[PDB]
Amino acid sequence: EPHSLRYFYTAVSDPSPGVPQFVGVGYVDGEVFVRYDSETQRMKSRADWIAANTDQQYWDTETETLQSSEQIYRLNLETLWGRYNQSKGSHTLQLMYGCDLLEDGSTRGFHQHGYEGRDFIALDKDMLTYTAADAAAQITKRKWEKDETFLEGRKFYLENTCIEWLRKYMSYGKDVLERRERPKVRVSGMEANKILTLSCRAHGFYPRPISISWLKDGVVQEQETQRGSTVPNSDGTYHIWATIDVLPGDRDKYQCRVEHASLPQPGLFSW
């Protein structure tokens, strides 16, 4: 299980309903815990366990940091407008950065920009050089790889500050983050004139990793199974379906198998 602290910034030239000019969102182990936007201009708590474990100075510094970032991405959009010949269009600038704590203790860091839904510039694994996707992004790269102290600063944040605040957050939220919630599973089916398609739905499981597969006489039918993507419910739990088409007379041979941390053994379910 790869633990993660990640921030996602989104800066647009043309806000619209649901899309403020700037949004910054923080995640621990895949789950929201803080949010900032240019609507409020406030780092706000998005999970009880982070609120319960910080003082108002925390929210005040975090708000200060993101107000600065908001101003800087306003400048970055103008900067990128002077780097391409597109006129008055919708511009989207995105940032993702953070750190992974892997199983063995080793660590990785990330700092990647996207412009107009494509890669723009990304910090490499050594964390001292960048990959530019195009000539516009190469102007940023030469500019940045010239500044020894800025390079060190970022490497240190991702290697040291990010990782240790991730550990603090993991402490703060252990009882939420490492809880288990059982999937409530239902197999449905509709026989048509010649083909019965079975549908296995798993409702409300936590944590997010799950394996759902279809079995004929206990033997997996991987090529015949069709999986939706894992998608969230409102209360931080998750949902997945898996279907398989079967011959009606062979109905009785088919069971849906769910592998999940909340289940003592892999669970089997039937129509």
């Binding site: 921030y7 910054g24 923080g26 780092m43 510094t61 975090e62 940091t65 993101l66 600065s68 970032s69 800087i72 400048l75 970055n76 900067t79 990128l80 950065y97 920009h113 510039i121 940023t140 500019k143 940045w144 500044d147 800025f150 600063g153 970022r154 944040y157 500050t161 990010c162 605040w165």
Partner: peptide, 9 residues
């Protein structure tokens, strides 16, 4: 803790 943005693009 969010990082302080010591450089623009």
């Amino acid at each position: 803790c969010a990082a302080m943005d010591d450089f623009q693009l």
